Structure formats: structure tokens, C-alpha cells
Give the backbone structure.
Amino acid sequence: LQDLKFVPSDEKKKQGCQRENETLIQRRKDQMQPGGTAISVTVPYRVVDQPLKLMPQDWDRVVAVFVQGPAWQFKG
Amino acid sequence: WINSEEFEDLDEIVARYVQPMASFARDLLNHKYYQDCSGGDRKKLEELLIKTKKEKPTFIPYFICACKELPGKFLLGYQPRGKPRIEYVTVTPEGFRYRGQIFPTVNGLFRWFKDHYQDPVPGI
């Protein structure tokens, strides 16, 4: 999501990256503004691997979730 | 089907029936009072409890150890005054079950046990 490029998780395991419970995404988006001016705003995004440990307001703040198939992930 | 529970596939079983139980079992092992009595020998637990009581007669020594005879159950022994008593704590995906009560947290279970160790043993 940050770099918009694909890397198989196997390659990252070779790289030995450290999985974090919480992750941040810094996407630079140009802002629609009057007069044609563009400002490269870097809006952070929050990624949660385990969604159970979120408060109700945080659950409201959720806007997107990737489904891997089976429904047992969602139950709860 | 595991007992009365339903599971969509093996990943659900491992990630929900075992992983919480493994975490719950790990919590008991990491507890300060945990000890390894040769895989859960009753005689070793009795001897250790008696020795601890002898060292500090005023205090009530209680210990928690894993039971090899009944995997998934932990042997909780305590010696209030005389012969140490032994009970079973079963590890379940919902937490720990002891005397017909389920406690998600180990700390809560210990507090209940300390405050209710004098109650009669259920089923006897």
C-alpha cells in the first residue's frame, strides 16, 4: 500500500523483516483545490493485523478490510 | 466438529482451539508459582508442598504444575494446615475452568482460589 509494488511474503521472510502488531502507511496524495494548485498531502493510514483488540470507536473508524476467503476470520 | 464446536477448516481449529489454549498454557508456565514436578507427579508436589509448609508454617503454600497424566489440565496443590490438597484446572479456549468457574485471566483465577480455598470441593 505504501509503495504500490508487489513483494511475496516469502521474499520478506528471506529479508527477515520484523512483523509489528500495528503498522502505519504514508501515502502522498495530491489535493483537489481551487485554482489548480496541488499540495502533496501525506495522510497516514493505520493497518491492524488482529482486529479483535479494537475499541468500538476504533471499529467505527475502520473503513476497509481484505478478505482472504473463509468466513471464520470474520466471526467475532 | 470438536466437542460441540464447529470449525470451517484446519486453520480455524489451530488458530482458535489451540492458539488460545497454548497462550493460556503458556501463561500458567510463565507464572511465578509454576513448577515442574517431573511432568506432574503427585508425590513430588506433595513433598514440595510439605517442605514449603515446614519452612513457613504460618503461610499456606500453593503451587501450580502441568499434569502429564491428563494433558490440558494443570495440577493445583495447596496445603492449608495438614495434608496438601490437589485439584485440576482445565485449559479451554475461553480461558481456565476451575470448580465450575471460567476465568479468562490467570490472576482472577488465583484471587478466587485464595479467597475460596476453604469451600467444599464440587462433586464431593
In short: Chain A touches chain B through three residues (CB under 8 Å). The longest strand of chain A covers residues 22-30. The first helix of chain A runs from residue 9 to 15.
